[PDB]
């Protein structure tokens, strides 16, 4: 009806008060069966058996680096700068990657090339600032900056992780075929 300080949904549901706990004298199991369970550790033995069953199942381990875990076309690994089939660079220095970069990991410099083209004179990625989010690759209007599926590029010195333009272009040249597999698989979804 009319509620004061309440409502139908704040009324307790049917059966919300719990039943009274049962005492020892209202137990179905006799004391000898309970003592058998108590002294012979029945549920502990069930647990041991469950563990032992696993011992005869196939393990999950793979033998890295001779085998490899699953990788997908969208995976975000080490960066590369790509070319056109002619060999001309795709990057035209729009600086959209630099603007979007959540970690401010990209530093770009550009001017007019002696042939009149709009091109970068400096393209740096601080890989120790990068968060590997893929936003640069989404932002690029010409598919110039990409993330490869490569994760195996650990270094012994930090200076080796400051990628300049030569390093990134060489990465593009090195990984172009894998990049093409990934693009052929995921371009329709972008």
């Amino acid at each position: 009806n009319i509620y004061a300080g309440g409502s139908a949904a704040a009324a307790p549901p049917a059966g919300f008060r719990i039943h009274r706990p049962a005492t020892w004298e209202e137990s179905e199991e006799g004391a000898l069966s309970k003592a058998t369970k108590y002294f012979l550790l029945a549920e502990m033995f069930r647990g041991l058996y469950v563990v032992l069953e696993q011992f005869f199942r196939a393990p999950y381990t793979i033998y890295y680096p001779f085998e490899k875990g699953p990788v997908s076309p969208r995976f975000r690994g080490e960066h590369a700068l790509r070319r056109y089939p002619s060999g001309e660079e795709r990057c035209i220095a729009c600086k959209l990657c630099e603007a979007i970069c959540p970690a401010l990991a990209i530093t770009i410099d550009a001017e007019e090339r002696i042939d009149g083209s709009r091109r970068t004179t400096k393209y740096d990625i601080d890989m120790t600032k990068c968060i590997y989010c893929g936003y640069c690759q989404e932002s690029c209007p010409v598919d110039a900056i990409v993330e490869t599926p490569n994760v195996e590029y650990a270094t012994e010195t930090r200076e080796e992780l400051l990628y300049n333009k030569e390093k990134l272009l060489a990465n593009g040249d090195k990984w172009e075929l894998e990049l093409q597999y990934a693009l052929d698989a995921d371009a329709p979804y972008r």
Binding site: A4, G5, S7, A9, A10
Partner: protein, 112 residues
Amino acid sequence: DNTSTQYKSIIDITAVDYPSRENRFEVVYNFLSVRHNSRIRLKTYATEVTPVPSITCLYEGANWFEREAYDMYGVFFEGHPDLRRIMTDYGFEGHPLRKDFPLTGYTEVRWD
């Protein structure tokens, strides 16, 4: 404690810095009523020298929230039993969530 409100859970306390106002800081309280399935927000104001009454007497959960509000903004809470920094480094100078505190602060560390 009113029967039609019954906001028993304290959700959060924070501050917002408005440097144009004479009172810089607005203190925001959010409350939940599980009884009525309802939320409510309450605002007040403060400056760098005028405190606010602590609500720890009413909600124990408020304790840490007021500490964070003191650590980030410098708002004091009168009646808070144990009010000290909770986030920043020991001996940290400044309240980093003020609009005039620079993003990277004033000091950095290294091994000497």
